[PDB]
Amino acid sequence: QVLTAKEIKRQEAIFELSQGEEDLIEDLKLAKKAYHDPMLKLSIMTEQELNQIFGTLDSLIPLHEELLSQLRDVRKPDGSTEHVGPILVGWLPCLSSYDSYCSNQVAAKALLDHKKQDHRVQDFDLWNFLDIPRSRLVKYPLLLREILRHTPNDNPDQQHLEEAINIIQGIVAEINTKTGESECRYYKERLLYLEEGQKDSLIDSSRVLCCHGELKNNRGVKLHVFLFQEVLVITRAVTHNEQLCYQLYRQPIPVKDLTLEDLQDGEVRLGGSLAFSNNERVKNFFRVSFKNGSQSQTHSLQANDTFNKQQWLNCIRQAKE
């Protein structure tokens, strides 16, 4: 009857939902056209490696095209939409494919982190388009709730939207839990212990990888560091028997014995052959040390930027508790 501001907001929310599907489809097709196809023709990575990076994305595109097609089809001649509830509830089951996808994400990301070392590739965001699908999944509750809050009590979409939101919340929570477990298992199976006393039961018992990432030490060594809930593991990414592995650099440091010290920019002292500007070389460092008699250790580690350095400080402090 009366056109309300709320109804205009509801139409905005519905239109926005479909535009996001369109944007996702466009970006995933673009990933394949600008990155996959081009690298394949120029053999920038093996067919194996490329299949492992864009291979699954192609199974997700049809899911979103189907949702978009249905949302488009239901619009009235004037472009408005009466109900989106039935369509969402009927489409949701196809999200089961996100389980398979999110589970293989760790292997793809691990490979991708290694490839940014290859010059052939870097002589080209290839590094983050893989996060697009998961980001969309995580955002569905927010997007559907934006429609719900402007949906009137006499509109049946209220119940259907409440249902869709609840179901997706359940899907996301489960996929996030499994992803966390898969990540921790994936890296534990790839740790390589080539020297005495590097194994530790705390690594074996870990079920949570708080955070991990590349850090460069004050001697120019590129390390991949893993903060499991109770133990820090410092490694170098290497290839051992056809596979990307993480060779322990020192014995693991139990979090209960890890002393963390923030270093101000310029406080670090560098060694070895010499980021390129002197200021870039001495910024964003922190120190981790471990008292262990003859095997005591100390590491001055450099994060990727100011934000990444804080992330590391926050995670280590949180794990220590």
Side-chain angles (χ1 to χ4, degrees):
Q1 46 175 60
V2 38
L3 175 64
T4 60
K6 181 172 186 172
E7 178 55 22
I8 296 172
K9 293 176 187 178
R10 193 178 69 99
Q11 295 298 317
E12 285 192 339
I14 288 169
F15 199 78
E16 284 157 22
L17 175 64
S18 87
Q19 293 185 119
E21 294 301 311
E22 180 165 35
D23 287 350
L24 175 157
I25 293 167
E26 163 185 67
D27 287 349
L28 292 188
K29 279 177 177 171
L30 178 59
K32 186 182 180 180
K33 288 287 181 183
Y35 293 143
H36 182 285
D37 292 340
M39 290 189 289
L40 177 162
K41 288 182 187 59
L42 297 170
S43 307
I44 303 171
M45 291 190 74
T46 76
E47 292 189 61
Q48 300 72 62
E49 298 170 327
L50 291 174
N51 290 319
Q52 200 194 310
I53 291 176
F54 314 73
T56 315
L57 287 182
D58 275 307
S59 71
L60 306 181
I61 295 176
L63 313 187
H64 296 286
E65 294 177 300
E66 180 64 35
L67 173 58
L68 183 59
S69 175
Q70 285 182 52
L71 292 168
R72 171 180 194 160
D73 172 68
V74 70
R75 282 175 190 162
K76 294 162 137 188
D78 70 2
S80 67
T81 295
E82 197 171 328
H83 309 108
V84 295
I87 285 174
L88 286 162
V89 171
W91 175 82
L92 297 183
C94 84
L95 286 184
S96 62
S97 302
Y98 270 65
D99 187 43
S100 182
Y101 181 69
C102 295
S103 74
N104 66 40
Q105 199 74 327
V106 66
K109 289 183 147 184
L111 168 70
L112 205 43
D113 286 344
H114 178 61
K115 288 290 169 167
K116 61 198 296 188
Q117 182 209 309
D118 183 334
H119 299 319
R120 191 182 175 193
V121 299
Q122 55 181 248
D123 301 316
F124 284 108
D125 189 64
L126 170 67
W127 315 113
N128 65 45
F129 76 98
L130 290 181
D131 297 323
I132 268 188
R134 192 196 199 76
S135 295
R136 176 82 172 163
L137 180 77
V138 158
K139 202 173 175 189
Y140 276 126
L142 177 163
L143 296 168
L144 302 192
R145 195 175 301 106
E146 177 59 28
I147 306 171
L148 175 61
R149 68 170 53 86
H150 304 302
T151 301
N153 305 320
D154 65 319
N155 189 314
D157 254 14
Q158 293 197 318
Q159 286 87 169
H160 292 139
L161 285 164
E162 289 168 349
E163 166 179 9
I165 290 162
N166 195 78
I167 296 300
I168 291 167
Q169 290 175 303
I171 287 166
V172 171
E174 185 54 38
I175 285 179
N176 285 344
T177 292
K178 291 181 191 176
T179 295
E181 306 172 313
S182 69
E183 190 175 51
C184 182
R185 190 177 61 249
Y186 178 84
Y187 287 111
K188 276 164 64 173
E189 308 189 321
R190 300 290 187 125
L191 294 179
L192 177 57
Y193 307 90
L194 304 178
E195 304 176 76
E196 290 297 64
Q198 298 190 319
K199 292 180 173 293
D200 198 297
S201 71
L202 285 176
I203 290 161
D204 304 354
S205 68
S206 301
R207 285 304 175 286
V208 55
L209 189 49
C210 307
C211 70
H212 73 90
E214 297 162 306
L215 292 172
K216 180 157 96 177
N217 78 4
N218 59 348
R219 293 181 301 277
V221 182
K222 303 189 185 190
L223 306 162
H224 196 100
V225 179
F226 298 95
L227 176 64
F228 289 102
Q229 189 69 273
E230 300 183 59
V231 63
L232 184 82
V233 183
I234 300 177
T235 76
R236 287 162 65 207
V238 302
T239 295
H240 180 77
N241 191 31
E242 316 182 60
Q243 286 179 47
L244 179 56
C245 291
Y246 304 95
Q247 183 181 346
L248 267 71
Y249 185 64
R250 299 282 194 277
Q251 304 180 334
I253 298 169
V255 165
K256 63 166 188 170
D257 307 311
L258 186 178
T259 297
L260 172 68
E261 292 168 329
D262 189 349
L263 286 52
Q264 291 183 297
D265 296 342
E267 193 177 338
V268 71
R269 300 298 185 245
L270 306 181
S273 181
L274 297 190
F276 310 86
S277 77
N278 66 249
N279 268 49
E280 296 168 57
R281 290 178 190 292
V282 301
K283 77 180 51 162
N284 298 150
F285 270 89
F286 60 93
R287 188 182 326 273
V288 171
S289 74
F290 172 45
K291 190 179 175 194
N292 196 32
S294 65
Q295 298 288 80
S296 293
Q297 295 172 44
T298 190
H299 301 278
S300 290
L301 301 176
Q302 181 182 53
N304 309 134
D305 48 47
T306 306
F307 174 65
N308 190 48
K309 166 165 161 176
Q310 193 63 49
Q311 300 181 297
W312 272 103
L313 295 187
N314 298 341
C315 292
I316 296 175
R317 290 166 176 154
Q318 179 64 63
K320 284 183 70 66
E321 293 167 70

